[PDB]
Design a protein around this nucleic acid. Structure first.
Lengths: 50, 76, 115, 174, 188, 31, 135
RNA sequence: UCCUAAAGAGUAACGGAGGAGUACGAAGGUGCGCUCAGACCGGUCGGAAAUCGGUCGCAGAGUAUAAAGGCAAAAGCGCG
RNA sequence: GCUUGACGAUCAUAGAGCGUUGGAACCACCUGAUCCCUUCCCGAACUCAGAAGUGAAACGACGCAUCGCCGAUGGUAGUGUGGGGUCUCCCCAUGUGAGAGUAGGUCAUCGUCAAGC
């Protein structure tokens, strides 16, 4: 469970932070989450915290 | 084999016994998995904490099938 | 039977949820012959209004279809307006919300009896 | 077919053959499972579909596969999870199924004695055998290597032994 | 069988201990399904002479509290577990129309003439005496005969295998509990 | 040859003995 | 000796030995018995020693019931051992005895032979015992 | 996590027993639906045993993981 | 004034078992699945349209105490305080007081609404 970053599909630079088991679920996560800087729900699609 | 090792004794049990005036957020019972169930105006939090949703006095009724102990608050 | 003690077990969650919220309840009891509708106050043990199919102005011989439930819909809505109740909750009583239960619910809802 | 013999003779034979007071405890005809044990070669995931294809057209109806329950790791392995197959022909489908079992298709392979003799358990015995996975319509000399088996018994939908041996027969059928 | 009794207007722990150690007495109660219970003092020396009798517990006992006399069946007995003597006696009213369960001893009559003893080498093992019964007070078995004469080696006599004398209901036979009464088995 | 072997055992009371011990009747699904 | 076949734990506490023996005070299987009148502790080779005294003094037959059962394990620190380095290990087994506990029971003998057999039995036991008959 | 711990909390020992340094994008949410396990008796490869048909049943099953405490509105189980 | 439904109050003195009895209204079983809807495979569950039949199953009412479950009185054990002793344990004063068992109970008692009598 190495930790990842879920950045917002909207134009902001807001990110939620979580984990993932890489060696079982290697594909990326496209979960719809709530962005506070635009104040609507948008998809989040990211990894690579560095 | 060797033997030490306890833990920090989580202070569980009955706060706010059975006739006491309660405010609308007070912890009733700290609980490790529902000895006492949620009655009339009481809440059942995440770790099975019973808390008060309204004011009144604590009831502690043994009600119904399954022999369950209920904490309820009677607005009195 | 094994049908009825199963559907009361199905119903019991919503029955027991509407007495937590202190909500006036609209119960149904479908049978194979016909359907009943009943308005129960927010404790379980007292009835405000009640309207069946065997009210003696709509016993017909064709009683027990998706039409008779729709008749009982407004027939319980206009009896509940007299009783002074809105913001009721619909109790399907373990029956699946699809046929004459759905029809009774929609026809009671059409008579301003707000679920 | 369960017909002119049933709706005019069998249902009024059994009221005075078992001396029943009113009708409806005359036995109905309901439900079993094959439980065709495809757990041979349990770690497969390739012959269950052949078993479903085998049992599909001989019954005219889709089965499901029945899964293992426990990890009984002495008999076989526990990862071989899909190990079953299952199809009822309904009372509505029993009609073409009754005049296809023990009407002309009674010689499955052979018997020297198909006796109705050696089982007194108080629930209504009969006698017939099914060991071959081929004795049915619509099967080839060879199209797929056919390894299966089909299991039918019958029970009273009713009370007892002697109250359930009589409805289970329909013709001169030992 | 007659015991003398008193009135006992004082109940409790220290009261009962004072009766036993100062007055030399023994508490008791008399009760039945038809009257109120009544607490009674008795004498330890005067009830311990009844308990010497073999037919003490399965018998009518007249009991005289004042001038009032009752018919009494002893149905309970408490006893000091170490030393062994009666503390409170705890007996029952007797009415002529009543079911009246009591314990009755077994009496094991002719054990020398036993065909699992004389010819075959074996000994008699009484696993049970004191059978509980269910009977009107008209038939009170002071004893129940257990004939052990026609019983072979290795053979077991059960509760069905003996006699119920003139309308006596053996209780365990009225359940599915056919208990083993006695036994003939090989020696050690 | 004496090497082939059928494997059917819950068919095996005498054909329709009622139950074996598991009690219901005719055909194979819980449909 | 008598030991359990396996126990749920290996060490008990020390505990106390209070009360009278209300349960275990009746001659429930035999005709005559050896009842204790003082409280104490029987160490499972006392029990077997009095057992062998009984079974050797009978010589003819009978049936002997041994009623007590040592289920309490007792530990020991060995010698040249400083105190408090963990609880010491089990050595033997013990039945806790209260006044009134029936220890042994016999049937099939005469009352005289039973009495002078439980005299041999009581000679090997650290308790104060007595002789009782079936009530 | 249980005992010691004295029926509220708390409570020591190089006292008695076990565990953890995580898993999970569903093992979370919700709606709808469903009960487990066990004896029985059943021999033409398994034979006490798999697959089921459950008569008796009568929570003893299960719960990601130690123990304790909880679970029918199941907190168990399946599906959208 | 009772019968059948639905909903609750209360959770065995209310349960389980065994027996009798209920069909016209009610409910259950029932007939058929075109059409809604459904079956890890279903018209046997879920669903619709019913009105030929049956109260067999189930459910209900009435009976029975063998089972389960309640359960006295009395005593016993424990124990607060005060004092004793032969002090790893008991006793006395005083207050309290079981669990078990014994006698004995129990085959429930209520309320709201709706159709019938």
């Amino acid at each position: 469970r190495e930790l990842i970053r879920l950045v917002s599909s909207a134009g902001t630079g807001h990110f939620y932070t979580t984990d993932k088991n890489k060696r079982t679920k290697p594909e990326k996560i496209e979960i719809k989450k709530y962005d506070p800087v635009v104040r609507q729900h948008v998809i989040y699609k990211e990894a690579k915290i560095k | 084999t060797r033997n030490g090792r306890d833990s920090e004794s989580k202070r569980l049990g009955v706060k706010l016994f059975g006739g006491q005036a309660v405010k609308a957020g007070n912890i009733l019972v700290r609980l490790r998995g529902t000895k006492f169930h949620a009655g009339y105006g009481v809440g059942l939090g995440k770790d099975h904490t019973l808390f008060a949703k309204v004011d009144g006095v604590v009831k502690f009724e043994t009600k119904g099938a399954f022999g369950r102990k209920y904490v309820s608050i009677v607005a009195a | 039977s094994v049908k009825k003690e199963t559907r009361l077990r199905r119903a019991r969650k919503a029955r027991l949820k509407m007495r937590e919220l202190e909500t006036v309840r609209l119960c149904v009891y479908r049978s194979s012959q016909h359907i009943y509708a009943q308005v129960i106050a927010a404790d379980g043990g007292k009835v405000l209004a009640s309207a069946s199919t065997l009210d003696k102005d709509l016993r017909e011989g064709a009683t027990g279809n998706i039409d008779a439930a729709k008749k009982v819909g407004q027939l319980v809505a206009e009896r509940a307006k007299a009783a002074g109740v809105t913001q009721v909750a619909f109790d399907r009583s373990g029956f699946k919300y699809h046929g004459r239960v759905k029809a009774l619910a929609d026809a009671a809802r059409e008579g301003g009896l707000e679920f | 077919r369960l017909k002119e013999l049933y709706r005019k003779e069998i249902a009024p034979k059994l009221k005075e053959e078992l001396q029943l007071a009113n009708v409806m405890e005359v036995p109905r005809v309901t439900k079993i499972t094959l439980n065709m044990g495809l757990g041979e070669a349990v770690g497969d995931k390739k012959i269950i579909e052949n078993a479903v294809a085998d049992l599909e057209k001989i019954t005219g109806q889709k089965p499901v596969v029945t899964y293992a329950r426990k990890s009984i790791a002495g008999f076989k392995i526990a990862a071989g999870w899909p190990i079953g197959v299952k199809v009822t022909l309904r009372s509505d489908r029993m009609y073409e199924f009754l005049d296809r079992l023990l009407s002309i298709s009674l010689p499955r392979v052979r018997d020297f004695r198909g006796l109705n003799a050696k089982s007194f358990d108080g629930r209504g015995n009969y006698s017939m055998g099914v060991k071959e996975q081929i004795i049915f319509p619509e099967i080839d000399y060879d199209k797929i290597d056919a390894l299966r088996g089909l299991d039918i018994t019958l029970t009273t939908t009713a009370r007892t032994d002697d109250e359930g041996r009589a409805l289970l027969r329909a013709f001169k059928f030992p | 069988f007659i015991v003398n009794a008193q009135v006992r207007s004082d109940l409790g722990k220290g009261a009962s201990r004072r009766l036993r150690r100062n007055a030399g007495l023994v508490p008791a109660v008399v009760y039945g399904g038809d009257k109120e219970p009544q607490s009674v003092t008795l004498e330890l020396r005067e009830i311990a002479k009844l308990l010497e009798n073999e037919a003490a517990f399965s018998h009518v006992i007249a009991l005289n509290v004042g001038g009032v006399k009752e018919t009494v069946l002893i149905k309970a007995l408490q006893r000091h577990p170490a030393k062994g003597f009666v503390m409170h006696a705890d007996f029952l009213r007797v009415v002529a129309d009543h079911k009246l369960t009591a314990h009755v001893p077994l009496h094991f009559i002719n054990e020398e003439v036993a065909v699992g003893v004389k010819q075959a080498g074996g000994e008699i093992s009484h696993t049970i005496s004191e059978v509980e019964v269910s009977c009107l007070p008209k038939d009170l078995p002071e004893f129940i005969e257990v004939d052990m004469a026609k019983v072979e080696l290795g053979q077991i006599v059960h509760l069905s295998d003996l006699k119920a004398p003139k309308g006596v209901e053996l209780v365990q036979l009225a359940h599915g509990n056919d208990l083993a009464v006695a036994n003939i088995h090989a020696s050690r | 040859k004496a090497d082939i072997h059928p494997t059917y055992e819950a068919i095996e009371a005498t054909c329709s003995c009622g139950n074996v011990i598991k009690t219901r009747s005719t055909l194979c699904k819980p449909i | 000796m008598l030991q359990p076949k396996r126990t749920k734990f290996r060490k008990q506490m020390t505990g106390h030995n209070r009360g009278l023996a209300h349960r275990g005070s009746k001659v429930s299987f035999g005709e005559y018995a050896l009842k204790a009148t003082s409280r104490g502790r029987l160490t499972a080779r006392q029990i077997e020693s009095a057992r062998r005294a009984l079974t050797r003094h009978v010589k003819r037959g009978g049936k002997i019931w041994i009623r007590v059962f040592p289920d309490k394990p007792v530990t020991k620190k060995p010698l040249e051992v400083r105190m408090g380095k963990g609880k010491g290990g089990v050595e033997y087994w013990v039945a806790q005895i209260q006044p009134g506990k029936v220890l042994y029971e016999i049937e099939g003998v005469s009352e005289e032979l039973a009495r002078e057999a439980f005299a041999l039995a009581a000679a090997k036991l650290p308790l104060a015992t007595s002789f009782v008959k079936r009530t």
